[PDB]
Design a protein around this ligand. Sequence first.
Ligand SMILES: CCCCCCCCOCCOCCOCCOCCO
Ligand SMILES: CCCCCCCCOCCOCCOCCOCCO
Ligand SMILES: [Ca+2]
Ligand SMILES: [Ca+2]
Ligand SMILES: [Fe+2]
Length: 675
Amino acid sequence: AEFRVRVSTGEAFGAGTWDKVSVSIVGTRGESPPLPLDNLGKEFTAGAEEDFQVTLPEDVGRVLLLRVHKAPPVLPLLGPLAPDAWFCRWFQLTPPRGGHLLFPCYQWLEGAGTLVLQEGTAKVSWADHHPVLQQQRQEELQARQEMYQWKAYNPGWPHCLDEKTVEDLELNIKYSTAKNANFYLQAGSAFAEMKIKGLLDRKGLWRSLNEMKRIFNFRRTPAAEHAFEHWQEDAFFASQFLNGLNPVLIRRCHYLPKNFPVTDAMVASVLGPGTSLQAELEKGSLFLVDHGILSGIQTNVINGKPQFSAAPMTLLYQSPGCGPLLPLAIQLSQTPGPNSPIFLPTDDKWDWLLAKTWVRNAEFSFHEALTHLLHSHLLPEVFTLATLRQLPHCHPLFKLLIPHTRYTLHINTLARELLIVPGQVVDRSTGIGIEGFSELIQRNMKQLNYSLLCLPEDIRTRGVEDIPGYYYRDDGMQIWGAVERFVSEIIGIYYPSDESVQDDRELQAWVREIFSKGFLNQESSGIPSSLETREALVQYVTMVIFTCSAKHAAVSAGQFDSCAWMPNLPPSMQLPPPTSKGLATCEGFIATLPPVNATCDVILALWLLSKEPGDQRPLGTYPDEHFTEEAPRRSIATFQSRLAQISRGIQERNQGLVLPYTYLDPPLIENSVSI
Ligand SMILES: CCCCCCCCOCCOCCOCCOCCO
Ligand SMILES: CCCCCCCCOCCOCCOCCOCCO
Ligand SMILES: [Ca+2]
Ligand SMILES: [Ca+2]
Ligand SMILES: [Fe+2]
């Protein structure tokens, strides 16, 4: 007859509420009326965990749902006051004579809304067949699909959330006021420094390479300083293909592309007289970085001056015995010929240095448009938006995936509002501009592939499983294994067979929506449009979580470290690539680099997008307990202690490196894409 209702309120700003809360307990035998949760003094203060003794007029049997109503106080002859938004963490019912019932919530309640909560026990559609519970699932997803809808942003792009401004978003997918404040303070302060220094308003060349060091007065990091110390070095130019900003392109080469006519004579110096180009190709010691996708891309106008982009090809040589990876040849065009020289390290100073810089510029355009924006933001959004629409609150995958979706819809809405719009940093200060970004995404979407998204398949495909000093791989694979083991445990707990995976209609709709809205129903993407086995499910889910956390962390963390010394990552180029050799000079080199304002505007932007604003949410840390059962909680503990072991391994490893790799240290990896 009696019931103890324990309720936890959020600690966030505004989490508390002055409004009155009432609950209706629904059971197999029936539903109770609205029951008040009103004790002496104020309840539902921010961070509060309070008990309420409630009594039901009659029996309800086994508890099924928990309907939570909220209404503002009611003055006689004045009506209600005003809605006071309330964030609820969880409910807990305790009937006689014992046995607790935990109802996880973790969402905002507003106005005359009604929160319907199931017991914390995760349940697939075929888990509990009670019609009251099936009705709850169906009506919930119906509401979700109405709340969060799709729209086409551009042709050939993945679809996105149908919201124009960040203000139109629901509270449940918004930045916390804390995180947002922290973010805008950091930005306003950063912009102020760069602005008052008059650098955002300087149209023209840097007076010298030395003046470019002024960036280190704005912001400063050891890795950024290190880039300036060694940017001219070949080993550093090459190593950044492995442990730098964009470590996903390098791949082993047994057959040199015909449009890249490197001869044995061109590489005889570096390789030595002991072998030849063909011999080393067969050895598997030669690797290639091909920015061909940039070929003929649309370019931007900066300060009324037409900008330029190359689409280079870089041949690299991995010297024996853990020696350095060294560049052999660079061609700055996809079309060979006398007007596109193959530059060697044996060329003069500025020819070779100019050639390398062009490749670094290609890395920028490629990284930010495809590796960062498309792969580490747009696809995670699709995963997020599909998850919200197709997987209900009580579904195991929702419980698993929901922390890895936090703020993703928010940050992307922000980008579409303030990043890739006219007048803003991309349009303003990048070489390829808005149309270039779009054109790249459009091309890449037509040849995307499931294997690149799954790290073990990615490393295998590119044939870089054994290349030394590849820390993005080394650390990335350990984390992937950890996530894969974590996911397989969760799947093993809830899905007893492959048939049980096939019959999950909600799961199949989830994969199908990602395939449709995310990858445009392209079979050539190699991405599943359905999941027929548990093995496939484990891999797919692992790919999602990994993409939303470590992948973004790996390609985001190094942005400022890489761009702070601008010659190491020029956002644009102001002259076309050289057509002859022996023309490059220091004066010409600076004339080719972007103007001061474009330089500092991009650096300002990348510095802000490198750091996770506000409080952190480390990978594998889930303060929101959606999983209330024991078995999933063990899996979380295992996943957490493993990440710690992986971390400690990375500390030891980095301790003996002049330039450590920290971008994949688990404590520094966010659960989701949020910046
Ligand atoms: C139109 C309104 C402009 C307001 C701009 C306010 C300036 C913001 O300053 C942030 C950057 O300044 C850095 C250092 O400022 C001095 C404080 O002391 C530094 C040592 O801790
Ligand atoms: C001075 C400009 C500061 C930039 C603030 C806007 C940030 C909002 O969008 C963030 C999310 O972006 C996702 C993808 O990022 C790729 C952008 O690349 C940087 C271009 O310079
Ligand atoms: Ca409030
Ligand atoms: Ca009270
Ligand atoms: Fe990002």
